[PDB]
Specification:
It is found in: Nucleus. InterPro entries: IPK, IPK_sf. The chain is α+β, with helices and mostly antiparallel strands. The protein has nine helices and eleven strands. The strands form three sheets. A six-stranded antiparallel β-sheet has the order 6-7-5-4-9-10. The chain has a three-stranded antiparallel β-sheet with strand order 1-3-2, with helices on one face. Helix 7 packs antiparallel against helix 9. It is globular and about 45 Å long. The chain binds calcium ion (CA). The site of calcium ion has 3 residues, from helix 8.
Length: 258
């Protein structure tokens, strides 16, 4: 599963084509490889899950404003409602979903309405209703829940929080330099839930993802159907505000853990 096939939206295709010592934006994105035709067209992308044994996935939507210019006022109105009623409008980001290995301690406290199990795996899908119902006060706990893998020691969970903080510092620095406007893009977090793989790699976790063409965790930026390059227009303040909040949250994870 080296590759992903995503239905092509012309604006997302144009964004990948336009893009592809602070890191450049492209280094956060999946590698775009081309298109496949059916006709139905698909974007062919690097699979960000490739190489993980038990990937644990967190999708976060970036921005207070959640519509672009091309939006019909019907969806413009729907998107203002989403922003106004979730952490998007207050904090600049919201949890969109997760797919994580179930932790018995977690499952006991989480409402049945917030997730979908299966018999065929140890994985739960944490749904949109969960992410939309997070408040400014409990959203930090929701992120700590993501990391609460039953197979990882407290030392490894902490390492990951620290590594992702560093990625957020680097991503913030990238965003100060990029002249783009990105609407409803996601940061995609992935970490390795299999501690045999932590053994194999001796707990060494690359800050930046290996260039695909020529990791125990990764942070990526995905979903560019409402993105475009905007040279001369300055940095994306809308997105950076969400990043600023994530930085505060992740720095707080490190408090008290001397
Ligand atoms: Ca080893």
């Amino acid at each position: 599963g080296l590759l992903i096939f995503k239905p092509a939206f012309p604006q997302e295709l144009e964004f990948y084509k336009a893009i592809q010592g602070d890191a450049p934006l492209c280094s956060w994105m999946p590698t775009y490889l081309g298109v496949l035709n059916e006709s139905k067209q698909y974007l062919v992308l690097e699979n960000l899950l490739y190489g993980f044994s038990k990937p644990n996935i967190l999708d976060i939507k970036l921005g207070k404003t959640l519509y672009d210019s091309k939006a019909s006022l019907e969806k413009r109105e729907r998107m203002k409602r989403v922003s106004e009623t979730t952490t998007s409008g207050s904090l600049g980001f919201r949890i969109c979903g997760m797919k994580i290995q179930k932790n018995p301690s977690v499952l006991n406290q989480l409402s049945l309405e917030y997730y979908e199990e299966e018999a065929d795996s140890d994985y739960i899908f944490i749904n949109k209703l969960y992410g939309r119902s997070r408040t400014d006060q409990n959203v930090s706990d929701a992120i700590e829940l993501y990391f609460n893998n039953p197979h990882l020691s407290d030392a490894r969970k902490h390492q990951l929080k620290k590594t992702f903080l560093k990625r957020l510092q680097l991503f913030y620095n990238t965003m100060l330099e990029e002249e783009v406007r990105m609407i409803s893009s996601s940061l995609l977090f992935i970490y390795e839930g299999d501690p045999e793989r932590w053994e194999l790699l001796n707990d060494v976790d690359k800050l930046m993802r290996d260039d695909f063409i020529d990791s125990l965790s990764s942070m990526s930026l995905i979903d560019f159907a409402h993105s475009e390059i905007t040279p001369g227009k300055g940095y994306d303040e809308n997105v950076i505000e969400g990043v600023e909040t994530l930085l505060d949250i992740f720095m707080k994870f490190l408090e008290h853990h001397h």
